[PDB]
Write a protein that binds this ligand. Structure first.
Ligand SMILES: [Zn+2]
Lengths: 90, 78, 97, 106, 98, 103, 95, 83, 92
DNA sequence: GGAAAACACCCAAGACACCAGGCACGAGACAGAAAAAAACAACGAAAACGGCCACCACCCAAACACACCAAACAC
DNA sequence: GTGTTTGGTGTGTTTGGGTGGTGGCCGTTTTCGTTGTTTTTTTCTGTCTCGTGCCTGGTGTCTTGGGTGTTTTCC
């Protein structure tokens, strides 16, 4: 399993006239896996800190707040809330 | 309130750090560094507090925020 | 009489590497902590142990930094620590970029 | 897969151009030291008229194609595409005049 | 809209992120919008990085992004480099800095 | 008790329950908690031995955080293990640099 | 009331086992409790990561031993492995 | 066959290239040995972990993932080779 | 004296290619691994990752060493600068 | 910290040589997969004592008061 | 040195509250067979790692010159 097709999708959405090497896709896959591990571990850590046995979007939001720096955290929070809001609406 | 950290207190910390002679700008430099450190730690603590839906900042929040930075502290209930 | 400058300094160094008591006044530090925290959320309360832990960590950090600063100052063949020494130490630790 | 270097007219595989560069034009093009965009802008895979030259000095064809001062090998009579304006200016800085081999200029 | 990605307008797989949240030993249960939120954040971050990697590949007159351009994009962005200060990029090189 | 059966002083049941309720693995084998209790007991025994030595060195019969700090920072292997931890009220080892000493 | 667990009695037993004529302050007992919790967390996280690396659902004594080997320094790791093996064999021989 | 003292396969010009990429303008003749020792201590620390992983998997071949975990354990996360 | 050094700095900062020779490095790695388990096999990607990590580490260390040497108002890096850097980094 | 002397460390330029490097082929250990086979961990249950909370009393050393000691700086 | 004399360690009597021990109880470890499956086990395939070999020259490097930049000295 790898995120290669999704990175192509995102790239063409962002840069139609740019291509990615195999090594750059390996790096991107490592990055995505690494970020998933960091965020999920911090969410679990939060759930245990607060004596919970479920990972809800609040835990994920505050995990993103802890991990990401100020402006990055703000933009990523906006993106996540937008996606969750539109998924709920649909 | 950062001027409450007087020059003698910074001198005491430098002497416990083994410093023999101290320049004159070291005090402001130290106030800035401490403010940055405290800012980071308090940001993490307040994030923890808001997440736990509390209005009081506990020692556990500070301890987890220090564990987040890697500055593990013993002797406060960890 | 009068001592050479630096003899009482060394007597103080011996005195403070022996003791463990906090070298900052508690109330100024508590006021500083509340002022800083007030920039993230107004009307916050702090357990006294939270302030104690914060003060311990901040002083421990500052003492380690002063040790690195002394290492840098002695490396440069000097004895007086300077703001540039602090900036170099904070950069070398990987604290300042 | 083969491409024709626009400047000197030599034809070599595009991966060869990327890995090693043009053996003749490297003094003014730095094709090996150039990215894929510059390699394409100076080496084109669309061409016509494969030419094999054995002796540059005495071959009248080489003089007619202005390749008598280059390495013998595969060359193209006509190459699709021209050098870019920025590369043209860079070559003019070096004092070398570029004559297109596209055939549209004669 | 059968896919959870379509329902959220995303490109990353919501179902795989959910599967990873369950078969990853993080918590006994997982919400329904936690995978969605995390997928949104991950897609945003990858797009953020790919923006600068495309910029760097276009600044080097290259059409393809290589590890060099990912390294440049990461080490040139203040926030990304702070996030990614302890990550080694293979074939990324260093930044020219004298 | 399972500590007696293994000749241990640390709890095996407590450690097994903490490993079980900590979301560490789907299942936990039975030889892990005995081994881990033995390791933890050994490490705490080492720490307490050196801290008692440090407290006697000061001619005290009760261990304070200062002796813990001295024992930790004075043992190379432990100090490598606990290299990032700060001990409240632990202080620092007495250490004056060679060039600062008077002449 | 609040029946919360700690390692204080075990730390005290170990202290009386190594140093009979030595006491411990409450703040040092707190430090020892924090230390025990820390080491537990480190070892359990390494064991979990190792089990998941090797695609196993079980934390056995092999995982604990190799996490100890990865984590502790030479002599300390050697003594700890000796202790763990001794205790495991003594526990398994009896029942 | 046993390997004996191959640290000197890190030639002096190689160490100079590593220093120049690092921004060093003038390099003391004692640096090269200093660096060599440092590198040894690093590699010995990484390899000891990689081998520890290889032996724990009851394997006989050192895989790339073993190296990746050994580096990740030291805070040396490496992108490009897996992760 | 002092121009080719800047040219080499520029060249090597423009590039990514590994600076230590691959086979001497492979043999060194095998020699070091020969202590941890006798008669080991290695993946090629294991050696490649090890070489990439080692060179990145050494380049960062040389960056810090140059920083210290400049701090001392010098231009030549000496082993005590490396030692100071490893001490401040927290290396054992 | 600045100015001053100056020397020899390191770089620089050069020619000579090695073995890395590149590629190849061969061999096969061992890795990956498959199929088999069982004890081991989880589950419920019952079970009993350890570990918790309360409370008690003693004495280490915190504290205050004396002193000899022995470095400090003055001469 | 020669000298008085500030700093600091050693010593003693006094206080007390926190360390230690002991009673009461309740809850969590404990013993246990069965269930069910994650292991271990064995056997087989086959890739790629090891193993070796040849030839080239990119590279490694031994060394002379020397200058600049490091170490020291004075103020
Ligand atoms: Zn050409």
């Amino acid at each position: 399993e790898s995120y290669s097709i999704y990175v192509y999708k995102v790239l063409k959405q962002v840069h139609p006239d740019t291509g990615i090497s195999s090594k750059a896709m390996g790096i991107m896959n490592s990055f995505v896996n690494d970020i998933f591990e960091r965020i999920a571990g911090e969410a679990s850590r939060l759930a245990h800190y607060n004596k919970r046995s479920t990972i809800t979007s609040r835990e994920i939001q505050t995990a993103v707040r802890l991990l990401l720096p100020g402006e990055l955290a703000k933009h990523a929070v906006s993106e996540g809330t937008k996606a969750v809001t539109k998924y709920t609406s649909a | 309130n950062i001027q409450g950290i007087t020059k003698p207190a910074i001198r005491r910390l430098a002497r416990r750090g083994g410093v023999k002679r101290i320049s004159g700008l070291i005090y402001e430099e130290t106030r800035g560094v401490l403010k940055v450190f405290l800012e980071n730690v308090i940001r993490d603590a307040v994030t923890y507090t808001e997440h736990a839906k509390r209005k009081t900042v506990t020692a556990m929040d500070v301890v987890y925020a220090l564990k987040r930075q890697g500055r593990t502290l013993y002797g406060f209930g960890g | 009489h009068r001592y050479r400058p630096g003899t009482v300094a060394l007597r103080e160094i011996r005195r403070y590497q022996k003791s463990t008591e906090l070298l900052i006044r508690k109330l100024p530090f508590q006021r500083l902590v509340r002022e800083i925290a007030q920039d993230f959320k107004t009307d916050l309360r702090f357990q006294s142990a939270a302030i104690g832990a914060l003060q311990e960590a901040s002083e421990a950090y500052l003492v380690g930094l002063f040790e690195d600063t002394n290492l840098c100052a002695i490396h440069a063949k000097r004895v007086t620590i300077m703001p540039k020494d602090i900036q170099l130490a904070r950069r070398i630790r990987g604290e300042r970029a | 897969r083969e491409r024709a270097c626009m400047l000197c007219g030599i034809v070599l595989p595009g991966r060869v151009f990327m890995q090693n560069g043009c053996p003749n034009c490297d003094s003014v093009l730095n094709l090996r030291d150039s990215d894929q965009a510059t390699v394409n802008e100076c080496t084109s895979s669309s061409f016509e008229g494969l030419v094999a030259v054995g002796d540059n000095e005495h071959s009248w064809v080489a003089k007619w194609l202005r390749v008598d001062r280059f390495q013998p090998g595969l060359y193209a009579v006509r190459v699709d595409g021209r050098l870019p304006s920025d590369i043209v200016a860079a070559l003019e800085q070096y004092g070398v005049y570029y004559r297109p081999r596209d055939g549209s200029v004669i | 809209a059968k896919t959870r990605s379509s329902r959220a307008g995303l490109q990353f797989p919501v179902g795989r992120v959910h599967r990873l949240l369950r078969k990853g030993n993080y918590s006994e249960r997982v919400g329904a919008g936690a995978p969605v939120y995390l997928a949104a954040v991950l897609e945003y971050l990858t797009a953020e990085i790919l923006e600068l990697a495309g910029n760097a590949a276009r600044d080097n007159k290259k059409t393809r992004i290589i590890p060099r351009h990912l390294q440049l994009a990461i080490r040139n962005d203040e926030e990304l480099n702070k996030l990614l200060g302890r990550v080694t990029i293979a074939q990324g090189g260093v930044l020219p800095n004298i």
